[PDB]
């Protein structure tokens, strides 16, 4: 799972904008 967390900012910066 740690290797997955390493790659979290592969996603576009369009999530969780309303936090």
């Amino acid at each position, epitope marked *: *799972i*740690q290797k*997955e*967390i*390493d790659r*979290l*900012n592969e*996603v*576009a*910066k*369009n*999530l*969780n*904008e*309303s*936090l």
Partner: antibody
Amino acid sequence: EVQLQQSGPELVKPGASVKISCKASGYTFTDYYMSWVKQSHGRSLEWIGDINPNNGGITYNQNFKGKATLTVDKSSSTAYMELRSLTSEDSAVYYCARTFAYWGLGTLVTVSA
Amino acid sequence: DVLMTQTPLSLPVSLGDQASISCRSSQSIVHSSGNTYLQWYLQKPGQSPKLLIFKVSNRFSGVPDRFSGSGSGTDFTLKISRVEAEDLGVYYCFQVSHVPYTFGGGTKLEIKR
């Protein structure tokens, strides 16, 4: 988008068991672990365990061994939790999550006679 | 197990003010890879946790830049440079470096009056 769809609310008798499900979409189900988290009283969070959908290998929280059993069905991109011998302490919201970054909406389990 | 201690329990602030939230681990949380997998979440009432920061200081996705996470050793901190109404809710830290993964007890951000 990544989406984790969890089964609806469960009303279970003390001492019974219930199986909860989490259907994944928007990504390749077998490329990522699936994790389960318990939240009681709308606050305290506890990690239950992770399952590797590819081979079915599991990393459990020691304190949930016997209480929780994790499985997967690759053909439907679904992860399952079955909770055994339920008590009042098992009333909670149970979340599934991918990489602890994409969370389902949670499945409320209420234990009551 | 690593105990994550969050303070304060509740933090009353004025909108537009800076705010900081503390998370203390009872021991080092450095994974065998050398990285520290400390995440911060915001959870709003009746909603699932939302990831803000991962691996101590990396801002997730489109999370506003007013949020930032930092720290080292056993001190970790979440800062909000300018608190807005959509930020009100409970903040949680979460260590995924050592099994069992563990959460802090949460800090509720509220309005002072």
